[PDB]
């Protein structure tokens, strides 16, 4: 580690988080999109928020299911990331980028070709998102043992993944998905609101749900109890949102009810919103641990870690831990009472750095002298080849 901190860039399907190693929050969180229209026609583009309407440019999304799908466009998006937002002279900073688990070696070579052949970085490291989220949880009070075994609940853009991790290495064959993520909570809240509250501009229907979700939601311990609380003490529980008719500039006034707690509930009752998929998040986690190697199951249940916006609802962790515990002892009941093994310690770890767990993890690691030891250098890339970037030894 020299005078200058490394650049840390975490490219997700929905947002890219970027800034410098050492800091606690990204310096920019910008949507992962690039609007485009001989010469320098290639330089006529915008990214992030500036890219979203832009009367005369088409908005593109180079990353799908966490994987770069348009390499020309990801390359261009890098150019502004480095020269417009970070204002890093890329020849003087090591870089740490990220990847979904199951991204291919070939893609890491493609990424390296971009970083070393176009931008001449001195050093590169591609980390797995899951692994940085574990590393993020070492920030937690409930954590004294620094470990990179654990189960990672990543609720990203479009689905939520339960990623089992042992000793730095994702167990690829054991990953499972849940077709529930923040968008759906929004969609369901939109649903619930649509048929109760009058005067949501049909056009601003979505933005209103998002606002309610982000401002008023939470996870409850029990629906019926929650319902009667609301039924009784309306003045405590029902809340007010006021918005602003975009077209016709007239405000509207709604109540915020049941959707406060029914929104996030669909993690726990996917049947409420998805007609094809009904297994609660809790069951899915259980299944994943039980599929993994026996000798690693206790560690997994002991260190379940959250990452992403959707995991931030007050009490998400508590409820997850509770329900998983109920499952786990249900099994260990139907076993003792069928002819007596140790009870399972189930720990769901929460902490402040959750929303950008991944980016925080990388920022912290790329601050350490060891990060400089494990990065591939440009001299390596030239003498041995892009294949060096196929493997990124874990460290910490």
């Amino acid at each position: 580690a020299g005078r200058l901190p490394a650049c840390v860039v975490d490219c997700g399907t929905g947002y890219t988080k970027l800034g410098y190693a050492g800091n606690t929050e990204p310096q920019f969180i910008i949507p992962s999109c690039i609007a485009i229209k001989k010469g320098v026609d290639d330089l006529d583009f915008f990214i992030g928020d500036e890219a979203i309407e832009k009367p005369t440019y088409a908005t593109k999304w180079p990353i799908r299911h966490g994987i770069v799908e348009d390499w020309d466009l990801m390359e261009r998006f890098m150019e502004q990331v480095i020269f417009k937002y970070l204002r890093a002279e890329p020849e003087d900073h090591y870089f740490l980028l990220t990847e979904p688990p199951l991204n291919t070696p070939e893609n890491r070579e493609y990424t390296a070709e971009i970083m070393f052949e176009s931008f001449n970085v001195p050093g590169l490291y591609i980390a797995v998102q899951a692994v940085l989220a574990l590393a993020a949880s070492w920030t937690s009070r409930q954590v004294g043992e620094r470990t990179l075994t654990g189960t990672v609940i990543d609720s990203g853009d479009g689905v939520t993944h339960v990623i089992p991790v042992a000793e730095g290495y994702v167990i690829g064959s054991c990953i499972k998905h849940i077709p529930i993520a923040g968008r759906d909570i929004t969609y369901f809240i939109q649903q619930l609101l649509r048929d109760r509250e009058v005067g949501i501009p049909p056009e601003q229907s979505l933005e209103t749900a998002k606002a309610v979700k982000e401002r008023y939601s939470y996870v409850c311990p029990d629906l019926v109890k929650e319902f009667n609380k609301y039924d009784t003490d309306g003045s405590k529980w029902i809340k007010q949102y006021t918005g602003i008719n975009a077209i016709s500039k007239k405000e509207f006034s709604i109540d915020v009810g049941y959707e406060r707690f029914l929104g996030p509930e669909i993690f726990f009752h996917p049947e409420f919103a998805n007609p094809d998929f009904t297994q609660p998040i809790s069951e899915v986690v259980d299944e994943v641990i039980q599929n993994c190697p026996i000798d690693v199951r206790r560690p997994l249940y002991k260190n379940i870690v959250l990452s992403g916006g959707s995991t931030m609802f007050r009490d998400f962790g508590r409820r997850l831990q509770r329900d998983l515990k109920r499952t786990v002892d249900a099994r260990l009941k139907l076993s003792e009472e069928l002819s007596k093994p140790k009870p399972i310690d189930v720990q769901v770890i929460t902490h402040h750095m959750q929303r950008y767990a991944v980016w925080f993890g990388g920022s912290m690691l790329a601050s350490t002298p060891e990060f400089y030891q494990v990065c591939h250098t440009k001299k390596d890339y030239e003498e041995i080849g892009p294949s060096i970037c196929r493997h990124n030894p874990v460290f910490g």
């Binding site: 019926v224 319902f227 009810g257 049947e271 009904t278």
Partner: protein
């Protein structure tokens, strides 16, 4: 999981494979008499808002079938009850919609024929048919106070909004 009934005695009575469950009411029918002050009609109405969102439901015992039925009817009421002003007009349309010959197990139109036993004979037929009617009225009744906002003319949206939701994606009508 969804909310189930606790009222099932190892010795409560069974019309078909439903539970012939005590209810305290100002109505006619073979529903037993009850000492305690919560009946299956209260369980259903209490559980309703939670349970109506579920699409899958384990029949653990015969009390559950009664609960299911009352749960589905609750949604019949609010179907009518929504489009009509003042409590008065309400409990009025609720006598009507209570009496109506609703499909019952074994008939084309009763959903859940795979789950509910059909009446073995004409006795059971006439009983079950009556029990069901008792409930439609005791149910349709209690629900009426709840739906209307004590400052009147007022069908509370906090009930009318469930109108479209269908328990287990099934409808008595």
């Amino acid at each position: 999981p969804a909310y189930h009934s606790s009222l099932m005695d190892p010795d409560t009575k069974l019309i078909g494979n439903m539970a012939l469950l005590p209810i305290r009411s100002q109505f006619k029918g073979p529903a037993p008499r009850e000492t305690k002050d919560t009946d299956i009609v209260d369980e259903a109405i209490y559980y309703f808002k939670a349970n109506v969102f579920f699409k899958n439901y384990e029949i653990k015992n015969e009390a559950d079938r009664t609960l299911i039925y009352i749960t589905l009817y609750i949604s019949e009421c609010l179907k009518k009850l929504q489009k009509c002003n003042s409590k008065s007009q309400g409990e009025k349309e609720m006598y009507t919609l209570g009496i109506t010959n609703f499909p019952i197990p074994g008939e084309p139109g009763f959903p859940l024929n795979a789950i509910y036993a059909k009446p073995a004979n004409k006795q059971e037929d006439e009983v079950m048919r009556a029990y069901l009617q008792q409930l439609r009225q005791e149910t349709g009744l209690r629900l009426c106070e709840k739906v209307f906002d004590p400052q009147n003319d007022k069908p509370s949206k906090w009930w009318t909004c469930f109108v479209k939701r269908q328990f287990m994606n099934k409808s008595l009508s």
